[PDB]
Symmetry: D5
Subunit: 197 residues, 10 copies
Amino acid sequence: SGNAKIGHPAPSFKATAVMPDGQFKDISLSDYKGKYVVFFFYPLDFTFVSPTEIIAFSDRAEEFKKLNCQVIGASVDSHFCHLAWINTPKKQGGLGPMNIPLVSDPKRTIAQDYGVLKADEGISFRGLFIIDDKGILRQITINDLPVGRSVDEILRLVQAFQFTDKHGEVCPAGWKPGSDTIKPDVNKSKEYFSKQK
Amino acid sequence: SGNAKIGHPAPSFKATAVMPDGQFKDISLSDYKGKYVVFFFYPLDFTFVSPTEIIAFSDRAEEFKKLNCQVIGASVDSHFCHLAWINTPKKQGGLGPMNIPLVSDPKRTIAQDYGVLKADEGISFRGLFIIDDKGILRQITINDLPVGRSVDEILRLVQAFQFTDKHGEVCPAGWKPGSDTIKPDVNKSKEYFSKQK
Amino acid sequence: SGNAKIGHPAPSFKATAVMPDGQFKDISLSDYKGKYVVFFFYPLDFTFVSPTEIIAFSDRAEEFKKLNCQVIGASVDSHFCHLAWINTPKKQGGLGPMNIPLVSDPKRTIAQDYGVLKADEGISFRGLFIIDDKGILRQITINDLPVGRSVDEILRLVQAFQFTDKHGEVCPAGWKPGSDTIKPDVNKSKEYFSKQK
Amino acid sequence: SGNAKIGHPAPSFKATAVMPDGQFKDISLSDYKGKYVVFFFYPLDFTFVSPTEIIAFSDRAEEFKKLNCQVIGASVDSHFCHLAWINTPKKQGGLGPMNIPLVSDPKRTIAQDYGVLKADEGISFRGLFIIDDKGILRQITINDLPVGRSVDEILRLVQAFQFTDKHGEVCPAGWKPGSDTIKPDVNKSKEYFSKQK
Amino acid sequence: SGNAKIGHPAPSFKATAVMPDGQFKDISLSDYKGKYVVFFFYPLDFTFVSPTEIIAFSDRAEEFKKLNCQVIGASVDSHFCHLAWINTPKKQGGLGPMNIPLVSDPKRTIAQDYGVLKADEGISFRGLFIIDDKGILRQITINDLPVGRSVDEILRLVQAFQFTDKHGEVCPAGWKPGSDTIKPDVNKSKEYFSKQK
Amino acid sequence: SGNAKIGHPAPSFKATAVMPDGQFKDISLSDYKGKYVVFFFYPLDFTFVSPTEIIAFSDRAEEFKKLNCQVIGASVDSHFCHLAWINTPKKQGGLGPMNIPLVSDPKRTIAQDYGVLKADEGISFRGLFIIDDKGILRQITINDLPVGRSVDEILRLVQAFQFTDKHGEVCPAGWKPGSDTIKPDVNKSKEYFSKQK
Amino acid sequence: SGNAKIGHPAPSFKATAVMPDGQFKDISLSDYKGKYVVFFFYPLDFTFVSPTEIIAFSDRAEEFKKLNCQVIGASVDSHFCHLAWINTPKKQGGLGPMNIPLVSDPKRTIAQDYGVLKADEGISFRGLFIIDDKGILRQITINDLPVGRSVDEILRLVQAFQFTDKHGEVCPAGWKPGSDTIKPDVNKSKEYFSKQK
Amino acid sequence: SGNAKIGHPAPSFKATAVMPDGQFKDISLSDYKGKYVVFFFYPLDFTFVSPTEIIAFSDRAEEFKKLNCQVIGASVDSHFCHLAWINTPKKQGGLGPMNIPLVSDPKRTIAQDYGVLKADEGISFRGLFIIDDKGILRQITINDLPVGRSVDEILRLVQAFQFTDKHGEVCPAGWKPGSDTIKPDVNKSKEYFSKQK
Amino acid sequence: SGNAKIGHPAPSFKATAVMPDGQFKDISLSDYKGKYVVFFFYPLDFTFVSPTEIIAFSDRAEEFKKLNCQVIGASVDSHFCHLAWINTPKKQGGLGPMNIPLVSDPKRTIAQDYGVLKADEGISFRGLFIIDDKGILRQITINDLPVGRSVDEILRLVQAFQFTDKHGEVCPAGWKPGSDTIKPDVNKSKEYFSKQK
Amino acid sequence: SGNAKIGHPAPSFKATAVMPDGQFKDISLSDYKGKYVVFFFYPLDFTFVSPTEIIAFSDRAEEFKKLNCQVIGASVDSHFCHLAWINTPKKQGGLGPMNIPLVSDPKRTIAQDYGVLKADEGISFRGLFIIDDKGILRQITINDLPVGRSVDEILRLVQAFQFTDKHGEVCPAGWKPGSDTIKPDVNKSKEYFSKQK
């Protein structure tokens, strides 16, 4: 969990990234205070699972946008290496044009802060972080190096967390838009448990 | 995450537990050595979101068993409390009969070892952990209190890691049984991008 | 025991509690300045000796009210577990309606502060503390698990104390209202010593 | 309480004491292993509440021997001061012939180990420790100066404990020889709850 | 010696004492400012050598008042014990009426302050401290437990110092009033050595 | 004071001294085991109250030899300074021949051990010690600088100590050879308190 | 400079490199014990001054080889990066085929060891070290980011060092093969200075 | 190395130097802001590679002045040891007149600050630091004792840096005045790369 | 050297000396500010080499006066000792009248300061220090115990140091008044060296 | 001063020196255990007092040779500076043919050990140390820079010590060969003091 604890302000940071239009702007998590943010880390540039999951995100970038949610990727590689990677063709193992910002963390501080730094390699694991509109860490997901994440599950989550923040109800197990939620009140909750069995 | 580090042995533990046939028993992580384990904490017994997750896991227990994987719940609550809750009918917010064991971590030391303890409440967060038959932790998943987790996603994840553990290939984003995988070699990986891109 | 010392103010604390009217409320020791307080811990909820000790106190609650004294009980169990227990009938091992508020000490801090923490189990022994309307500890009592306490001996004590408070005349051994008291002076004490044998 | 923790070996001690027959003699708490012990402190000699306590314990010392229970009393006063006090007629604030032994804790180390020391004046409060035949502390009772203790209650305790020892069964609230006990098992306990109320 | 240094101000103290008249009165060493003071300690109350000493001073008291000198004795025994001792026919070791005050040092602190505390026994030694009107310790005497002190010799000392305090001269070996003295000047000294041996 | 504690062996020492026969030797406390010793310091050589005090001893040397007691003097002055003082006419303020050994402590270590070292002046106070044949410190006497000490008094003591040593009785206050002693026993002591007045 | 000190063994290291024949190999600096080594660091990959420096070395490699001198390049970038770079057309800013191993140092330990890490960027400066066939560092050269080094100069140094390692003489300023060298003696030195200056 | 880091203000210093014009003078690196400074250390006065190195800089000095660059030499040798040497004809090994100041560092503090001190001998290595007009160090060159340096290379470097300084373009390897340079921009850098092999 | 640093303010001190005109006086080194000072130490009083050294300075004091130089003797011996020793016939190993102050350092603090205390003895080595008219120490001379210093050499030194302070010229080896001195200039020094052999 | 202490072994050292026969060699104070040794420091080569001092010792070298004493010079200057200055003719300010070795102390650690280092300047005061054939320091002489030492005296001192070590007598002030001495015994010395006055 590093220094990022769920329920608390997510570790801040200011890094150089590759915007969805080429060119290098200095992005800060803080610049998004007001929008949800799916900040995810991936191992190394020019590897395998990575391009598959980072492309999967850029492509669906719109779906997240319709949720006032800004996705943001990051690795320990330099921005120059990031650019070179996006220019590389997909069929060739590259990312190709991106609709998502890609952050570089060559100090590995952003990594240490989020506790996803595989020290023995100076690499970061497949950590994903869902921090909300106010800056509070709401979900954290880490996978070992051989297994990619699921944009769908991560979408489900954001919607989920966005619901609760505005309805004072809680999302039962495996909730999805339309599913039954429940009132977190000893009495009021029985209106949910009752219609179960 | 506290002490649990993906890629290393999952912190061990010895704790009292209410087995599926009712009745207590001292359980140890090691006991389950040789098969996958999905260890998951939930804040408190008699709550609202928790009951849904725990029950979802119980019922889907066979699915996990087929996957040669043991599901184990966990909470700071005492076994006496656990039992009492399982003994409460579902329509009253109770668990009902269980197919899974519910460990009890009253010294809050286990939650500690899994960096899932919400110190300001002596209660754990909605953290999940999947460790493999060799004892190494392969994936940490943590949710803020309001949003329940997804059994399907965990199943996907277990299947994933298993696939990679026995095949020597890696799993692309969103991978599921049937999907294409990518040979983690610089060259032999083109056979994947050459089409799956 | 712990930070609780006979003579000095009683370790402060603020915890959630289940109010007599079956309602959650954050209570503080301090909110009782001006009244004597009998603060007692009990191992766990849904146990055996314990339910006898608190119904004892809950039933004979008026007897303390007469003596302007609040009886507050507490264990490390969640206020959800607490309510659940009070909702379990007595013939089934429950508590049934209470006239005494029950407190949840999940972070174990209150038990640690009063020295009644049974480390190796994250449980509290059966410690009872009687505190005067000024807030300073007057009498402390701890029983090992198997042996429940005596609601009469507390009654006796809470009375003997309020007596010394208003008379500056000490209570001899086995004292009870009506019993002869002895004057704390070298001479005015024989008025008690000669009148015995 | 000090180094005195219930469930653990009661703080050892070796002091000079004034035997029942007069005659001084260094005795050690270990000397009484194999027998239950009622070790109690009293503020000072030639005081008030105190003698009412040590004679009461001395006279009913019979009932304790009938329980293979040794009673020992102590104060920071020297042994020469204890003899002089047993040799001072009751009717004059004195003790008179003693059945139980009184130990002198001049260096105050014993009061410290049991944490009954009232530092602000080199005196010990009214603390009582009922320790058993194995040497483990089973009950701690401590009183503020103005209020003497109850030999009946301590009797009840020394009785209740020995009961639980030999019966692996537990004594409810207010238990006294004859009254129903309860058994520490979710099912068997019902036998107790099923009745009462 | 603990804190008592010759030539420096004697360690201050404020203890409860049994006054010559009979009542208990807090007394501070400073209270006797302006007067000389012979302060002495004795092991215990109800001992042997001790009372003989205490009695020697309580009587010769006048001789001391003559020398504008206050006398005070002390032990670690309580004041209650102190009184009980004076209220004991001197025929059987009591002290009987006292013209001197008996100081109670239960905290063992003032003793510690003079460095006459026999820690291994929590009892003081036969320490004698002569501190003058200006409040500064002028002489220290300490005897093992067996042998008492000498009111005579102490009287010679008090006498001696006072002399030098006024005449700016020094008293040679075993000097009693009326004996030659010597002017502390290389030259003026001759007036003594010449008239001597 | 210092390390020299009453009850334990006197701190050892090996210094250079001027023997009663002229010429120097290296003495050690130890060289005197089996015989009582009276070790006394004195401020400076060629002073006043000092020679009066020291000559007093060399003279009565015998009365001490008779008690199998060796007397030894010490100051921070070199041994050459000692030898020059003895060769200075008594009338001139010298010592003249001596029958007592005088040791030098030019490193103040012996004075520091006995805690008679007036640091601010690098001079030793008027401290005297009496150590038994077994070598343990029995009495310690220290006077400020302007007042000598009585040989007659430190003679009585040595006799008082040798007595208690071989008789099993204790020398009351003011004891002197031939005076009433008393047996330290609650009973066998009354043979003394009774025959008082 | 870091842990690199001319005169002592150059800091040992083992990292994954990309060999000339393409292909990854874990190289260790000891692997070349026996031949001179010109180890050099360069900022990042896909930069400017850097690739002009690296291909300049790959192209002139044979010159070093004739000198039994292994050359090795290094940067913080991953090996997958170093590979994607060599597989980039020189005109495209790439490196093209390479004739020297390019080590990866993602943990910045190697940089830190040679003290060429630019902390504020986690990028290495343009540092080059030339260590001999015994493993000891003989020369260190470092340039601020914006100015590339000069292969000619390196060549000259390697020759000059090798020259001295074999001719027991020393190379003067500006020296190139076939230039006047000098005897490190006070006399044969004149052989240079004289017929010269 | 030491306290000198390229990118930061070059360690400061002030020491006694022999001006090119003979006669002492306390020089300070700060006296040179506004202009580049090539600062070089050398082992010892009256050595071999040294004279050739310093005499070499002394001569080409005009080429540096041309470049608005001050050159300064330094050794642990005194100012006197220095002068004597300069006042020695080259044919004998001396330096002969100079056009460069020679700093003296008997304290060895300037060397430690530059990390060029050879502790085992209290002599420095052949370290040369070229620092710019703003005080910030730009290049560090250190050779082992046996091998002299190239005044040519320095020259190229001082030139190279001055260039990058004034032009905002980067100098490829080997770069000399006239040589091609690249625009440090992803795109604009291409107009140089396409012009290559 | 202790704190005695050549070229630094000689260590200050205030001690009780024995003035020439008989009698005692608290003297300080700052008292002699304005004149040169030859502060010499000597082991012990009443010894051998010492008096021969001190009466040598006493005897030739006028010569040091003619240079505005105060000579001061020092020893750890008390001022009383000093006086007795000066008041002892030379033929008897005494000093006889003294025209020089003899300071007393019974606290060894002054000796520790001039680092000449022979700690393992309490005595001091034959150390002499000559400090100038500004308080700065200009020469330290200390001999082992059996070899005495020579007043002549000390006179030569004072003359030389004073000379230098006046003519800003250094005195060659062995210099005496009238001897050829040298100008501390590289050039103007040839006036000395060239006029040599 | 430093680690050099009169009466203890002289701080050992090993340094390269320039033997009288020219051309280097590494000597160690140790290479002399058997011959007296006069070791002297001088601030700098090519200065002023210094030369006059060392050519002074070098000339009278035979003086000590016949006293089995070995003179040794030293300074921070390199052996190279040493030599250059040696070959420098006296009339130019140089030394010329030496008959004494001149160790070199570039580490400035030998001066440190001899507490003759002048830190602030990196030089060493004019300190001279005469150690005996057994390695123990006997005399330390240190002058401030401007004033040279005196061979004559040093010669006198070596002679003195040799005499004391050889005859068991001590040398009064200004002692020279032939001068009489005192037999270091109280009475025996008397045959010296009488021959005076």
